[PDB]
Assembly symmetry: C2
Homo-oligomer: 575 residues x 2
């Protein structure tokens, strides 16, 4: 099938871990041998232990039992620990490779699927495949060693009784299943024909609204008498047919036992037979009934494990960034132009953007005005090349953006919004998310103080080196905004995108926020999602887009005089 | 608890079948004795069998085994059959009593609870209680006999080793459960502390948008390396605990075994001891572990059975038809009067009918016109006293309904509708639901002929003695109407009510239906649910009822001149 080539693919991963697997295999083999020898211990106990007057063997028995138990315990511990180590290291390397591939492949992938399932793909699926494969391997090795040792012990004690107890058992199972299936078919036919009396009872029970008028209580009661008799007779037949089953199976199994006993009477096997040899041979069959049951199901577990590994490898090599450009930008001038750009959301229809023509010179600022969607978020994403446009051109400093490297393009730009992702790290390291050692602490504190962030950071425990709580436990929305502003100031990025529609206007101390923002985009260009007026009236250019289509252009006064959708949004305060 | 009171209440029902229970008990005791004797058979086989040169016991062993197995099979068959007979007869009598009670119980329950689930408590509930009680009885009897036999056998063979085993087992169980409990607590604590590190990986997988912009893939990889080391170390600890769990239990169990062996080494017990005795005693423990596991769950089964019986009994006793009147009417004159009758549907609110005033003389006919509900169905139910009115008076021939018996009142009235309940019987007997012998076949055929029923009945197999198929397989809607008309014609009811709104007017050969209806209510009073015009224009009186109150009264011409709701319904063809 497809599983074994997958296992061949995993051998390069598990190869440097062969020592642990070998130790675990040896320990498991010794575990199985310990159990088999414990069963083999039964013969001396029943043979020379109690019947004879000697005491040495009976008093020596508990010590060797305890020794075998200590050996079994320590070998189980060693085997499980080494399998644990191999599984853990394989899980480490597979998760690490999967995540390293994950952090470089496009946004659309996790846009499509929920992040909870994406996490489960690495925290459960890898654990699932490791656990299933390790369980299948340990089952095969241990139960195979136990089966081989048990068969060897059985044959060495009495090969004649072993050959009698073999081949006889499969035909006994054949007869048992034949009888069981015949009786199951009989019961199925009985259940199929049982429905008519129930239907008749339901038909009678539904006629109250009609039987009540005509006084047919007596006749209907007689009808129920007959149908109840016919219901009980079929129940009798049902239960009798069901109950014939178990006596037949018991009788056939015990007749097999009687055949074994009768065959043991012949002098062919009685010569080498001893009172202890049968006690170990029959008990060995009793024990051996379980390993085959647990060994015939290994294929299901292994197939499940390899299916999980295949669905993981599907994610492992789906795709990655379309890195094609090879020119780096020291610092973008600031002029960006959209010409006839039309983009469609992958996996959907009804394209959001079409035929946009915009020019943003260096230093100037453009504010986008529109409805809830309005394609503004799509434009903000496309400026930083989260996605790739289908038709149209984006000219940055006179050249196409796609002929440039992704790293330089993303470094030249900054994104500021309330929904900025904090993380479990220190504020000093968080402000400079990358290039931490390329920026001094003095620069960090100066950037924080010019962003009006030192007001709360200083009056907060552990100073500037405090670790941010998980998903802003310690930090607040205004504090998140201040941290993002400080991050923007620290990295001198000419191109900025400023989202404000999702922000709440109920926060206090907004004067500091507006002052910091006013000091922010000096001598640099910023596209602002115009929702707050303070970024609206003083904006150099205001562009109106409805449903992802450009509609209006001009300054605030010109748009207000036009009395278009700009004024209508003015009455509603832009939503 | 309350279960035993219900069992004592049920005991008189089962009492007349004491022979079946006695035979089943004797058979089950013999079954358990057969099993324990088969177990006791081990001692001769392993003591005087293979070891000694004599072979008589070994060759006579298979016949003993076969005989014990034949005895077990036949006694299991007898016990199961007799328990089946007792259960079947108890179910028969209980269902019969419950059903006979139920058809004497008002239609209020029938409308409250669906008839599709009412049979679920005559076919499944009674079967459930009988099966559970019988299973509890056999589980007590057979398993108690088995454990008593096992204890007697063990104490008869070697009571020293028996008391050692029965003293050692409980403390072994105590230690095993203590170890399992503490290790389960450790495992749940490990899960509690594993959640907080599992949630850490998802904290960075959500940062794709933020990671991509600032080029923090290297720092992200380092963070994942750390949180992956922390993941695998905790997985190590988890699996190490889960692996140290089991060997402790195994070691304690086999140390108990070693203690048993070392104690049996002492000369105080070994002197009278032999190999067969230890074999049978240890096998007796092995076999006895199952009954006490299954004998301790009898209370749950008995509680379930008695709860089912409690529900069934609660259905068994409830309110029945209020039989307060004690006067029989030979034949009602026909005059019926409603005065200020207000009735509310039980279990609901918003009374359907209120302040209705109507006078219906003998021979005259009245047709009710209204909307879908309009309370017409309520009036049809109330005239025949399906329910009891709350406030108001109904005077039948100048006398109240409740003053007269329910049986005579329902005998006086006739109900005609499309939804007449056919049933599994012959058409000749169907025409007269009751008093079949009080009406001759000649009268039946004449009534069918004047009801235009011979048109299709004769051209249909087996003639007038045909049995109606299950839920009207043979009969059709028009045929159902014709047979209901014949049923009404055969028994000369002075008062009849017929419904027409639920009827379909698309049927063919309606001329015969209208002719039969015209010939039907000659010289007797009929109340027609006015939906078909042919019963509307020629109606002696027409009464309009809206939302349960009478609004218009008069002839068709007067109502049409009034141009009220009657005319508006006339344009819409009265629905």
């Amino acid at each position: 099938l497809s599983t074994w080539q997958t296992f061949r693919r995993l051998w390069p991963t598990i190869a440097p871990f062969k020592a642990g697997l070998i130790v675990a295999g040896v320990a498991l083999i010794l575990n199985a041998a310990s159990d088999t020898f414990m069963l083999s211990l039964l013969k001396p106990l029943l043979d020379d232990g109690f019947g004879k007057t000697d005491r040495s063997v009976l008093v020596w028995m508990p010590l060797v039992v305890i020794g075998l138990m200590i050996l079994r315990g320590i070998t189980s511990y060693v085997s499980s620990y080494c399998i644990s180590w191999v599984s853990g290291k394989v899980v480490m390397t597979m998760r690490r490779r999967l995540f390293g591939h994950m952090m470089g492949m496009p946004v659309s992938f996790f846009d499509k699927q929920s992040t909870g399932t994406l996490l489960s793909r690495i925290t459960y699926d890898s654990e699932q495949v490791a656990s299933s494969s390790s369980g299948a391997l340990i089952t095969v090795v241990r139960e195979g060693a136990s089966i081989i040792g048990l068969f060897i012990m059985m044959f060495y004690y009495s090969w004649q009784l072993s050959i009698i107890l073999i081949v006889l058992a499969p035909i006994v199972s054949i007869a048992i299943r034949v009888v069981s299936k015949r009786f199951r078919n009989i019961s199925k036919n009985m259940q199929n024909t049982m429905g008519q009396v129930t239907t008749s009872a339901e038909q009678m029970l539904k006629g109250h609204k009609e039987v009540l008028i005509f006084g047919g209580q007596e006749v209907e009661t007689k009808r129920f008498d007959k149908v109840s008799n016919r219901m009980r007779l079929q129940g009798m037949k049902m239960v009798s047919a069901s109950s014939i089953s178990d006596p037949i199976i018991q009788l056939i199994a015990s007749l097999a036992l009687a055949f074994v006993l009768y065959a043991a009477s012949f002098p062919s096997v009685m010569d080498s037979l001893t009172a202890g040899t049968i006690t170990v041979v029959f008990s060995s069959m009793i024990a051996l009934m379980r390993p085959l049951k647990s060994l015939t199901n290994v294929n299901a577990q292994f197939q499940r494990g390899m299916a999980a590994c295949q669905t993981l490898f599907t994610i492992l090599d789906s795709e990655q960034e379309k890195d094609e450009g090879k020119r780096v930008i020291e610092r973008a001038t600031g002029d960006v132009e959209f010409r006839n750009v039309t983009f469609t959301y992958p996996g959907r229809d009804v394209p959001a953007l079409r035929n946009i023509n915009l020019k943003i010179p260096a230093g100037k600022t453009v504010a986008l005005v529109g409805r809830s969607g309005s394609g503004k978020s799509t434009i903000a994403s496309l400026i930083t090349r989260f996605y790739d446009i289908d038709e149209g051109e984006i000219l940055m400093d006179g050249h196409d953006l796609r002929e440039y490297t992704l790293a330089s393009l993303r470094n030249q730009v900054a994104l500021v919004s309330q929904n900025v992702h904090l993380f479990n790290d220190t504020v000093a390291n968080n402000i400079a998310y990358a290039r931490t050692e390329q920026y001094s602490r003095e620069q960090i504190e100066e950037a924080a103080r010019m962003a009006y962030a030192m007001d709360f950071i200083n009056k907060m425990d552990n100073g500037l080196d405090t670790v941010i709580g998980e998903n802003g436990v310690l930090l607040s929305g205004g504090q998140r905004q201040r941290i993002a502003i400080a991050r923007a100031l620290l990295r001198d990025s000419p191109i900025l995108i400023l989202d404000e529609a999702t922000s709440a206007l109920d926060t206090e101390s907004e004067r500091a926020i507006q002052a910091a923002l006013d000091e922010l985009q000096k001598n640099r260009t910023s596209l602002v999602i115009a929702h707050r007026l303070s970024t609206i009236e003083k904006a150099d250019e205001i562009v109106v887009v409805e449903d992802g289509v450009i509609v209006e252009r001009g300054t605030h006064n010109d748009l207000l005089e036009h009395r278009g959708v700009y004024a209508q949004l003015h009455k509603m305060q832009f939503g």
